[PDB]
């Protein structure tokens, strides 16, 4: 089965004033021109859809599920939603993450999302040596990130680009080694034309690559 | 002179939590050693209002930049965010308590970071950015983790919780940073983890109260 999952981590969701949403929408345009009829596309909007965070209730529920105790109606409701998010994630073999860079790390709701999809025995497992990803079946990820600064000049900025470093480390771990990030970078330093034209060109290439 | 405890544990107060036990041991030692004229404040991220960056916040910020009028909702959220910022700026000693969930800081702790990293307030675009909190402030992070992160292996390379916090607080001008790793809760006996962690926070308490 061929399914593409769009993980939209932008707080504005669909507002085209945003650089990363424009770039994504241009990606989506090219991608749909090129995919098969056998290819489904799903999207989760992290700032619009319900994405449960790890809280007392979730930790309590996960404790009980280890003992085999009964869950309260609240624990059932939140664990069920988290199961839907996990299974939706495992159901896809192409992923597109869209995010603005805010304070050198992933958006908080994207952290909640990671907390839903990094699940022992589901996307990774523990081993004698340590732990190992379970999603090693040729999946592909494209990250689209807009940023005010430039992160490819190998300087202090590069060193604190934790958003990219974390996402690549996490997904590489789960088994996704075909990874590309498109950085619509330098929005605070470069001509809007230059930033956008370069990011449109890059996601056009990505669409072509991902559609084969 | 004020100490600010930033509690990023979703369980808040539950002593089944290793990071909370270690914090409470720290706090009890600290309270014994500090002076009368010293205030301790605490914000519990999972039991308080810490605005996340959403549509409303972003729009409020754009309107503040265009000199446009704010809606009541935009007003209310930005007022709460400036209250959090000022509470953060008001303190010279900080304690962050967190469990390690998925190799990064808790999501509410990122929200908190988004409230306190503010231009012209805790840093300034300037030639480069510089921190405004360069007045000898101290930062203690108490972190509980299943794994061990001090062996200089793969685990060390993905400990983004510590790496991020240290980089952000250095950037704000807070260079006196110390992390207490109550680590190995997935491999060592719980009493073994606690004994070492308790000694670290007892020395931290003494050093910070001095
Ligand atoms: C609250 C906030 C925090 C930001 N933090 C960073 C940052 O840490 N590094 C950076 O390069 N740009 C930062 N920026 C600039 C944004 O990344 C830049 O405006 C980007 O174009 C936003 O993407 P978008 O247009 O899709 O929303 C920040 C902007 C805001 C509003
Ligand atoms: C959802 C979840 C994610 C976790 N992720 C990590 C991890 O990425 N690295 C690690 O060393 N331990 C991880 N752990 C183990 C916890 O860090 C460990 O249990 C720690 O003791 C929890 O802190 P606490 O006792 O203060 O709640 C995770 C635990 C849970 C429940
Ligand atoms: Zn287009
Ligand atoms: Zn309470
Ligand atoms: Zn024992």
Short mmCIF file of C-alpha atoms and ligand atoms in Angstrom, two decimals:
data_model
loop_
_atom_site.label_atom_id
_atom_site.label_comp_id
_atom_site.label_asym_id
_atom_site.label_seq_id
_atom_site.Cartn_x
_atom_site.Cartn_y
_atom_site.Cartn_z
CA UNK A 1 0.00 0.00 0.00
CA UNK A 2 1.12 3.53 -0.85
CA UNK A 3 0.09 6.30 1.48
CA UNK A 4 1.57 9.73 2.06
CA UNK A 5 1.09 11.36 5.48
CA UNK A 6 1.43 15.12 5.79
CA UNK A 7 2.32 16.17 9.32
CA UNK A 8 1.56 19.88 9.44
CA UNK A 9 3.25 21.38 12.52
CA UNK A 10 2.49 25.02 11.71
CA UNK A 11 0.36 26.94 14.24
CA UNK A 12 -1.35 28.91 11.44
CA UNK A 13 -2.35 25.60 9.77
CA UNK A 14 -3.48 26.81 6.30
CA UNK A 15 -2.63 30.55 6.28
CA UNK A 16 -0.63 31.29 3.10
CA UNK A 17 1.05 34.32 4.65
CA UNK A 18 3.45 31.70 6.09
CA UNK A 19 6.63 30.83 4.11
CA UNK A 20 6.61 27.16 5.08
CA UNK A 21 2.91 26.73 4.25
CA UNK A 22 3.43 28.37 0.78
CA UNK A 23 6.38 26.05 0.13
CA UNK A 24 4.34 23.06 1.29
CA UNK A 25 1.36 24.04 -0.87
CA UNK A 26 3.66 24.33 -3.88
CA UNK A 27 5.08 20.88 -2.97
CA UNK A 28 1.55 19.47 -2.78
CA UNK A 29 0.63 20.95 -6.16
CA UNK A 30 3.57 19.26 -7.92
CA UNK A 31 3.21 15.98 -5.97
CA UNK A 32 -0.46 15.45 -6.85
CA UNK A 33 0.29 16.07 -10.54
CA UNK A 34 2.74 13.17 -10.41
CA UNK A 35 1.43 10.39 -8.09
CA UNK A 36 -0.74 7.41 -9.06
CA UNK A 37 -4.43 6.89 -8.46
CA UNK A 38 -3.26 4.12 -6.13
CA UNK A 39 -1.61 6.71 -3.91
CA UNK A 40 -3.62 8.08 -0.99
CA UNK A 41 -2.70 11.28 0.87
CA UNK A 42 -3.62 11.97 4.52
CA UNK A 43 -2.92 15.08 6.56
CA UNK A 44 -2.86 15.79 10.27
CA UNK A 45 -2.84 19.42 11.38
CA UNK A 46 -1.01 19.44 14.72
CA UNK A 47 -2.53 22.82 15.73
CA UNK A 48 -6.07 22.00 14.63
CA UNK A 49 -6.65 18.25 15.17
CA UNK A 50 -6.54 16.58 18.60
CA UNK A 51 -2.96 15.60 19.43
CA UNK A 52 -2.79 14.42 23.06
CA UNK A 53 0.22 15.47 25.09
CA UNK A 54 1.89 13.25 27.65
CA UNK A 55 0.19 14.23 30.93
CA UNK A 56 -0.77 12.58 34.26
CA UNK A 57 -3.67 10.72 32.66
CA UNK A 58 -1.55 9.25 29.85
CA UNK A 59 1.20 8.20 32.27
CA UNK A 60 -1.42 6.67 34.57
CA UNK A 61 -3.04 4.84 31.67
CA UNK A 62 0.33 3.51 30.49
CA UNK A 63 1.10 2.36 34.04
CA UNK A 64 -2.18 0.41 34.25
CA UNK A 65 -1.71 -1.13 30.82
CA UNK A 66 1.54 -2.56 32.21
CA UNK A 67 -0.15 -4.07 35.25
CA UNK A 68 -3.23 -5.05 33.28
CA UNK A 69 -5.57 -2.98 35.44
CA UNK A 70 -8.80 -1.29 34.34
CA UNK A 71 -8.67 2.12 32.66
CA UNK A 72 -10.97 5.02 33.62
CA UNK A 73 -13.18 6.45 30.87
CA UNK A 74 -10.72 9.36 30.64
CA UNK A 75 -7.70 7.10 30.28
CA UNK A 76 -9.49 5.08 27.60
CA UNK A 77 -10.45 8.17 25.64
CA UNK A 78 -6.96 9.65 25.51
CA UNK A 79 -5.14 6.34 24.88
CA UNK A 80 -7.55 5.54 22.05
CA UNK A 81 -6.79 8.84 20.28
CA UNK A 82 -3.06 8.23 20.68
CA UNK A 83 -3.52 4.77 19.16
CA UNK A 84 -5.21 6.31 16.11
CA UNK A 85 -2.31 8.72 15.64
CA UNK A 86 0.26 5.90 15.96
CA UNK A 87 -1.53 3.59 13.54
CA UNK A 88 -2.06 6.44 11.06
CA UNK A 89 1.69 7.09 11.22
CA UNK A 90 2.59 3.39 10.72
CA UNK A 91 0.14 3.18 7.82
CA UNK A 92 2.18 5.63 5.70
CA UNK A 93 5.40 5.08 3.74
CA UNK A 94 5.94 8.70 2.73
CA UNK A 95 5.97 11.50 5.29
CA UNK A 96 6.03 15.28 4.89
CA UNK A 97 6.65 17.44 7.98
CA UNK A 98 6.00 21.19 7.72
CA UNK A 99 7.26 23.53 10.44
CA UNK A 100 8.37 27.09 11.14
CA UNK A 101 11.54 27.33 13.22
CA UNK A 102 10.64 28.88 16.55
CA UNK A 103 13.44 29.12 19.15
CA UNK A 104 15.81 26.54 17.67
CA UNK A 105 13.69 23.42 18.32
CA UNK A 106 10.57 21.63 17.06
CA UNK A 107 7.15 23.22 17.76
CA UNK A 108 5.65 21.99 21.07
CA UNK A 109 2.77 20.24 19.30
CA UNK A 110 5.30 18.38 17.15
CA UNK A 111 6.91 17.16 20.36
CA UNK A 112 3.48 15.93 21.44
CA UNK A 113 3.26 14.20 18.04
CA UNK A 114 6.63 12.44 18.53
CA UNK A 115 5.32 11.36 21.95
CA UNK A 116 2.42 9.62 20.19
CA UNK A 117 4.47 7.84 17.50
CA UNK A 118 7.59 6.72 19.36
CA UNK A 119 6.10 3.69 21.08
CA UNK A 120 7.97 0.60 22.31
CA UNK A 121 7.09 -2.57 20.41
CA UNK A 122 5.31 -0.45 17.76
CA UNK A 123 7.91 1.78 16.01
CA UNK A 124 11.01 0.69 17.95
CA UNK A 125 11.92 -2.09 20.39
CA UNK A 126 14.39 -2.61 23.22
CA UNK A 127 17.20 -5.13 22.63
CA UNK A 128 20.01 -6.62 24.72
CA UNK A 129 22.41 -4.04 23.25
CA UNK A 130 19.95 -1.12 23.48
CA UNK A 131 17.01 -0.34 21.21
CA UNK A 132 16.32 -0.54 17.46
CA UNK A 133 13.78 1.01 15.07
CA UNK A 134 11.01 -1.12 13.56
CA UNK A 135 10.23 1.06 10.53
CA UNK A 136 13.10 -0.14 8.32
CA UNK A 137 11.01 -0.90 5.21
CA UNK A 138 12.16 1.83 2.81
CA UNK A 139 10.04 4.76 4.01
CA UNK A 140 10.80 8.37 3.06
CA UNK A 141 10.55 11.68 4.82
CA UNK A 142 10.65 15.23 3.58
CA UNK A 143 10.94 18.04 6.13
CA UNK A 144 9.95 21.57 5.05
CA UNK A 145 11.27 24.15 7.52
CA UNK A 146 11.19 27.94 7.24
CA UNK A 147 13.62 29.92 9.39
CA UNK A 148 14.69 33.54 9.86
CA UNK A 149 18.36 32.62 10.01
CA UNK A 150 20.68 30.59 7.78
CA UNK A 151 21.84 27.16 9.03
CA UNK A 152 24.15 25.95 6.27
CA UNK A 153 27.19 28.16 6.93
CA UNK A 154 28.63 25.77 9.54
CA UNK A 155 28.63 28.24 12.44
CA UNK A 156 26.88 28.70 15.80
CA UNK A 157 23.52 28.69 14.00
CA UNK A 158 24.29 25.25 12.55
CA UNK A 159 25.23 24.00 16.05
CA UNK A 160 21.87 25.04 17.58
CA UNK A 161 19.58 23.93 14.75
CA UNK A 162 18.07 21.39 17.17
CA UNK A 163 14.82 21.11 15.19
CA UNK A 164 16.57 19.48 12.25
CA UNK A 165 19.12 17.57 14.35
CA UNK A 166 16.38 16.07 16.51
CA UNK A 167 13.98 15.12 13.70
CA UNK A 168 16.73 13.50 11.66
CA UNK A 169 18.12 11.64 14.69
CA UNK A 170 14.69 10.42 15.78
CA UNK A 171 13.44 9.30 12.37
CA UNK A 172 16.79 7.79 11.38
CA UNK A 173 16.52 5.78 14.63
CA UNK A 174 12.99 4.48 13.90
CA UNK A 175 14.33 3.23 10.56
CA UNK A 176 13.68 6.12 8.16
CA UNK A 177 17.04 6.70 6.49
CA UNK A 178 15.69 8.27 3.28
CA UNK A 179 15.43 11.78 4.76
CA UNK A 180 15.49 15.24 3.12
CA UNK A 181 15.04 18.65 4.68
CA UNK A 182 14.21 21.67 2.54
CA UNK A 183 15.21 24.82 4.43
CA UNK A 184 13.35 27.94 3.35
CA UNK A 185 16.02 29.76 5.34
CA UNK A 186 17.15 33.37 5.79
CA UNK A 187 13.68 34.91 5.72
CA UNK A 188 15.05 37.63 8.03
CA UNK A 189 18.18 38.25 5.94
CA UNK A 190 17.40 37.55 2.26
CA UNK A 191 15.08 38.86 -0.46
CA UNK A 192 11.63 37.16 -0.22
CA UNK A 193 12.00 36.34 -3.92
CA UNK A 194 15.30 34.46 -3.38
CA UNK A 195 14.11 32.46 -0.39
CA UNK A 196 10.83 31.41 -2.00
CA UNK A 197 12.18 30.70 -5.51
CA UNK A 198 14.87 28.44 -4.01
CA UNK A 199 12.44 26.55 -1.78
CA UNK A 200 9.89 26.12 -4.59
CA UNK A 201 12.62 24.71 -6.83
CA UNK A 202 13.74 22.28 -4.10
CA UNK A 203 10.25 20.91 -3.22
CA UNK A 204 9.53 20.56 -6.97
CA UNK A 205 12.54 18.24 -7.15
CA UNK A 206 11.39 16.46 -3.99
CA UNK A 207 7.89 15.94 -5.43
CA UNK A 208 9.44 14.38 -8.55
CA UNK A 209 11.72 12.18 -6.47
CA UNK A 210 9.01 11.06 -4.05
CA UNK A 211 6.46 10.32 -6.82
CA UNK A 212 8.66 7.66 -8.47
CA UNK B 1 16.78 37.84 45.84
CA UNK B 2 14.61 35.09 44.40
CA UNK B 3 14.78 31.45 43.30
CA UNK B 4 12.37 30.24 40.57
CA UNK B 5 11.51 26.56 40.29
CA UNK B 6 10.28 25.58 36.82
CA UNK B 7 8.56 22.23 37.22
CA UNK B 8 8.20 20.57 33.81
CA UNK B 9 7.00 17.22 35.13
CA UNK B 10 3.53 16.21 33.88
CA UNK B 11 2.92 14.44 37.22
CA UNK B 12 3.63 17.75 39.05
CA UNK B 13 3.80 16.50 42.67
CA UNK B 14 3.75 12.69 42.52
CA UNK B 15 6.71 11.20 44.48
CA UNK B 16 6.57 8.02 42.41
CA UNK B 17 8.56 10.23 40.00
CA UNK B 18 12.34 10.09 40.34
CA UNK B 19 12.91 13.73 39.22
CA UNK B 20 10.30 14.96 41.70
CA UNK B 21 11.84 12.97 44.59
CA UNK B 22 15.23 14.43 43.71
CA UNK B 23 13.78 17.94 43.46
CA UNK B 24 12.01 17.61 46.83
CA UNK B 25 15.28 16.44 48.41
CA UNK B 26 17.04 19.43 46.83
CA UNK B 27 14.33 21.88 47.96
CA UNK B 28 14.32 20.64 51.57
CA UNK B 29 18.12 21.04 51.77
CA UNK B 30 17.97 24.42 50.06
CA UNK B 31 15.27 25.80 52.38
CA UNK B 32 17.43 24.88 55.39
CA UNK B 33 20.40 26.84 54.09
CA UNK B 34 18.93 30.01 52.53
CA UNK B 35 18.33 33.30 54.36
CA UNK B 36 15.09 34.76 55.69
CA UNK B 37 14.96 37.50 53.05
CA UNK B 38 14.92 35.01 50.16
CA UNK B 39 11.81 34.14 48.17
CA UNK B 40 11.13 30.86 46.41
CA UNK B 41 8.56 30.77 43.60
CA UNK B 42 7.42 27.78 41.60
CA UNK B 43 5.62 27.40 38.32
CA UNK B 44 4.21 23.97 37.52
CA UNK B 45 4.01 23.84 33.69
CA UNK B 46 1.45 21.02 33.61
CA UNK B 47 -0.73 22.59 36.27
CA UNK B 48 -0.76 26.20 35.12
CA UNK B 49 -1.44 28.37 32.07
CA UNK B 50 1.67 28.62 29.90
CA UNK B 51 0.53 29.95 26.50
CA UNK B 52 1.78 28.03 23.50
CA UNK B 53 2.52 29.81 20.24
CA UNK B 54 -0.73 29.44 18.27
CA UNK B 55 -2.61 31.51 15.65
CA UNK B 56 -3.81 33.97 18.29
CA UNK B 57 -0.33 34.65 19.65
CA UNK B 58 1.23 35.05 16.19
CA UNK B 59 -1.54 37.41 15.10
CA UNK B 60 -1.21 39.41 18.33
CA UNK B 61 2.51 39.75 17.65
CA UNK B 62 2.03 40.87 14.03
CA UNK B 63 -0.49 43.47 15.20
CA UNK B 64 1.94 44.72 17.82
CA UNK B 65 4.47 45.17 15.00
CA UNK B 66 2.05 47.01 12.74
CA UNK B 67 0.78 49.19 15.58
CA UNK B 68 -2.69 47.74 15.08
CA UNK B 69 -5.25 47.25 17.83
CA UNK B 70 -5.47 43.88 19.62
CA UNK B 71 -8.62 41.80 20.13
CA UNK B 72 -9.57 40.93 23.73
CA UNK B 73 -8.30 37.37 23.21
CA UNK B 74 -4.98 38.59 21.76
CA UNK B 75 -4.74 41.02 24.68
CA UNK B 76 -5.37 38.39 27.32
CA UNK B 77 -2.84 35.89 25.97
CA UNK B 78 -0.07 38.45 25.54
CA UNK B 79 -0.68 39.75 29.08
CA UNK B 80 -0.22 36.22 30.45
CA UNK B 81 2.96 35.77 28.38
CA UNK B 82 4.49 39.02 29.65
CA UNK B 83 3.68 37.97 33.25
CA UNK B 84 5.63 34.72 32.72
CA UNK B 85 8.54 36.63 31.19
CA UNK B 86 8.72 39.06 34.10
CA UNK B 87 8.50 36.28 36.66
CA UNK B 88 11.40 34.61 34.83
CA UNK B 89 13.44 37.84 34.71
CA UNK B 90 12.77 38.51 38.42
CA UNK B 91 14.85 35.56 39.65
CA UNK B 92 18.62 34.98 39.98
CA UNK B 93 18.48 31.22 40.56
CA UNK B 94 16.51 28.77 38.44
CA UNK B 95 15.71 25.09 38.93
CA UNK B 96 14.24 23.07 36.09
CA UNK B 97 12.77 19.64 36.88
CA UNK B 98 12.02 17.26 34.04
CA UNK B 99 11.74 13.59 33.09
CA UNK B 100 13.36 12.62 29.79
CA UNK B 101 10.60 11.72 27.33
CA UNK B 102 11.82 10.90 23.80
CA UNK B 103 15.21 12.59 23.91
CA UNK B 104 13.98 16.21 24.12
CA UNK B 105 12.41 18.60 26.62
CA UNK B 106 8.70 18.17 27.57
CA UNK B 107 6.39 19.99 25.19
CA UNK B 108 5.16 22.38 27.91
CA UNK B 109 8.78 23.25 28.60
CA UNK B 110 9.15 24.29 24.93
CA UNK B 111 6.04 26.48 25.39
CA UNK B 112 7.72 27.99 28.45
CA UNK B 113 10.89 28.64 26.45
CA UNK B 114 8.71 30.38 23.83
CA UNK B 115 7.44 32.70 26.56
CA UNK B 116 10.85 33.69 27.95
CA UNK B 117 12.99 33.97 24.79
CA UNK B 118 11.92 37.46 23.78
CA UNK B 119 13.79 40.16 21.86
CA UNK B 120 14.78 43.29 23.84
CA UNK B 121 13.84 41.45 27.05
CA UNK B 122 16.09 38.40 27.61
CA UNK B 123 18.31 38.89 24.53
CA UNK B 124 18.77 41.42 21.76
CA UNK B 125 19.33 41.26 18.01
CA UNK B 126 22.58 43.23 17.77
CA UNK B 127 27.39 42.16 15.55
CA UNK B 128 25.05 39.34 16.58
CA UNK B 129 22.55 38.41 19.28
CA UNK B 130 23.56 38.79 22.94
CA UNK B 131 21.94 37.67 26.20
CA UNK B 132 20.56 40.27 28.61
CA UNK B 133 20.66 38.02 31.68
CA UNK B 134 24.45 38.28 32.11
CA UNK B 135 24.39 39.18 35.82
CA UNK B 136 25.62 36.00 37.50
CA UNK B 137 22.38 34.03 37.41
CA UNK B 138 22.47 30.31 38.17
CA UNK B 139 20.66 27.44 36.56
CA UNK B 140 20.17 23.92 37.93
CA UNK B 141 18.54 21.22 35.83
CA UNK B 142 17.35 18.03 37.53
CA UNK B 143 16.71 15.38 34.86
CA UNK B 144 15.53 11.80 35.34
CA UNK B 145 16.10 9.35 32.49
CA UNK B 146 15.78 5.63 31.81
CA UNK B 147 19.13 5.57 30.05
CA UNK B 148 22.65 6.69 30.93
CA UNK B 149 23.98 9.73 29.03
CA UNK B 150 27.49 10.17 30.37
CA UNK B 151 29.23 7.41 28.39
CA UNK B 152 29.97 9.47 25.24
CA UNK B 153 28.05 7.13 22.93
CA UNK B 154 24.89 7.33 20.80
CA UNK B 155 22.81 8.24 23.87
CA UNK B 156 25.10 11.18 24.60
CA UNK B 157 24.77 12.43 21.01
CA UNK B 158 20.96 12.45 21.15
CA UNK B 159 20.48 13.97 24.63
CA UNK B 160 18.75 16.97 23.08
CA UNK B 161 16.99 17.93 26.32
CA UNK B 162 20.30 18.88 27.97
CA UNK B 163 21.93 20.20 24.78
CA UNK B 164 18.99 22.51 24.01
CA UNK B 165 18.54 23.86 27.53
CA UNK B 166 22.24 24.53 27.98
CA UNK B 167 22.51 26.25 24.58
CA UNK B 168 19.42 28.41 25.12
CA UNK B 169 20.35 29.51 28.62
CA UNK B 170 23.98 30.22 27.63
CA UNK B 171 22.51 32.29 24.78
CA UNK B 172 20.43 34.24 27.32
CA UNK B 173 23.61 34.96 29.30
CA UNK B 174 23.12 32.31 31.96
CA UNK B 175 26.46 30.53 31.94
CA UNK B 176 26.50 29.05 35.45
CA UNK B 177 24.60 25.91 34.35
CA UNK B 178 24.63 22.51 36.12
CA UNK B 179 22.65 19.38 35.28
CA UNK B 180 21.98 16.62 37.77
CA UNK B 181 21.34 13.41 35.86
CA UNK B 182 19.24 10.94 37.84
CA UNK B 183 19.97 8.60 34.97
CA UNK B 184 19.83 4.84 34.49
CA UNK B 185 16.41 4.35 36.08
CA UNK B 186 15.94 1.62 33.46
CA UNK B 187 19.11 -0.30 34.32
CA UNK B 188 20.17 0.49 37.89
CA UNK B 189 18.37 -0.19 41.16
CA UNK B 190 16.16 2.79 42.11
CA UNK B 191 17.90 3.25 45.49
CA UNK B 192 21.25 3.35 43.64
CA UNK B 193 20.03 6.11 41.27
CA UNK B 194 18.58 8.11 44.17
CA UNK B 195 21.62 7.94 46.49
CA UNK B 196 23.89 9.49 43.88
CA UNK B 197 21.28 12.02 42.74
CA UNK B 198 20.56 13.01 46.36
CA UNK B 199 24.23 13.73 47.01
CA UNK B 200 24.50 15.86 43.87
CA UNK B 201 21.49 18.03 44.80
CA UNK B 202 22.71 18.31 48.41
CA UNK B 203 25.99 19.79 47.15
CA UNK B 204 24.07 21.91 44.62
CA UNK B 205 21.88 23.21 47.44
CA UNK B 206 24.93 24.10 49.56
CA UNK B 207 26.75 25.79 46.67
CA UNK B 208 23.69 27.78 45.59
CA UNK B 209 22.72 28.81 49.14
CA UNK B 210 26.23 30.02 49.91
C1 LIG C 1 8.39 33.24 18.22
C2 LIG C 1 9.36 33.13 17.07
C3 LIG C 1 10.56 32.45 17.27
C4 LIG C 1 11.48 32.33 16.23
N1 LIG C 1 12.67 31.66 16.43
C5 LIG C 1 13.58 31.53 15.39
C6 LIG C 1 14.78 30.84 15.57
O1 LIG C 1 15.05 30.32 16.66
N2 LIG C 1 15.67 30.74 14.51
C7 LIG C 1 15.36 31.31 13.28
O2 LIG C 1 16.15 31.22 12.33
N3 LIG C 1 14.17 31.98 13.10
C8 LIG C 1 13.28 32.10 14.15
N4 LIG C 1 12.10 32.77 13.95
C9 LIG C 1 11.83 33.35 12.59
C10 LIG C 1 10.95 32.37 11.80
O3 LIG C 1 11.56 31.08 11.70
C11 LIG C 1 10.74 32.93 10.41
O4 LIG C 1 9.92 34.07 10.53
C12 LIG C 1 10.06 31.90 9.51
O5 LIG C 1 9.93 32.45 8.21
C13 LIG C 1 8.67 31.54 10.01
O6 LIG C 1 8.13 30.57 9.14
P1 LIG C 1 6.63 30.74 8.57
O7 LIG C 1 6.65 31.95 7.67
O8 LIG C 1 6.24 29.50 7.78
O9 LIG C 1 5.69 30.97 9.73
C14 LIG C 1 11.18 32.89 14.99
C15 LIG C 1 9.98 33.58 14.79
C16 LIG C 1 9.06 33.69 15.83
C17 LIG C 1 7.76 34.42 15.63
C1 LIG C 2 6.86 8.15 27.17
C2 LIG C 2 8.23 7.93 27.73
C3 LIG C 2 9.34 8.28 26.95
C4 LIG C 2 10.62 8.07 27.46
N1 LIG C 2 11.74 8.40 26.69
C5 LIG C 2 13.01 8.22 27.21
C6 LIG C 2 14.13 8.57 26.47
O1 LIG C 2 13.97 9.07 25.36
N2 LIG C 2 15.40 8.36 27.01
C7 LIG C 2 15.54 7.82 28.28
O2 LIG C 2 16.66 7.62 28.78
N3 LIG C 2 14.43 7.48 29.01
C8 LIG C 2 13.17 7.68 28.48
N4 LIG C 2 12.07 7.34 29.23
C9 LIG C 2 12.30 6.77 30.60
C10 LIG C 2 12.16 7.90 31.62
O3 LIG C 2 13.03 8.98 31.28
C11 LIG C 2 12.48 7.35 33.00
O4 LIG C 2 11.45 6.48 33.39
C12 LIG C 2 12.55 8.45 34.04
O5 LIG C 2 12.82 7.86 35.30
C13 LIG C 2 11.22 9.17 34.16
O6 LIG C 2 11.38 10.26 35.04
P1 LIG C 2 10.45 10.37 36.34
O7 LIG C 2 10.62 9.15 37.21
O8 LIG C 2 10.94 11.59 37.10
O9 LIG C 2 8.99 10.48 35.91
C14 LIG C 2 10.79 7.52 28.74
C15 LIG C 2 9.68 7.18 29.51
C16 LIG C 2 8.40 7.39 29.00
C17 LIG C 2 7.20 7.02 29.84
ZN1 LIG C 3 2.90 26.78 -6.63
ZN1 LIG C 4 -2.20 21.94 41.60
ZN1 LIG C 5 16.49 -2.10 45.52
#
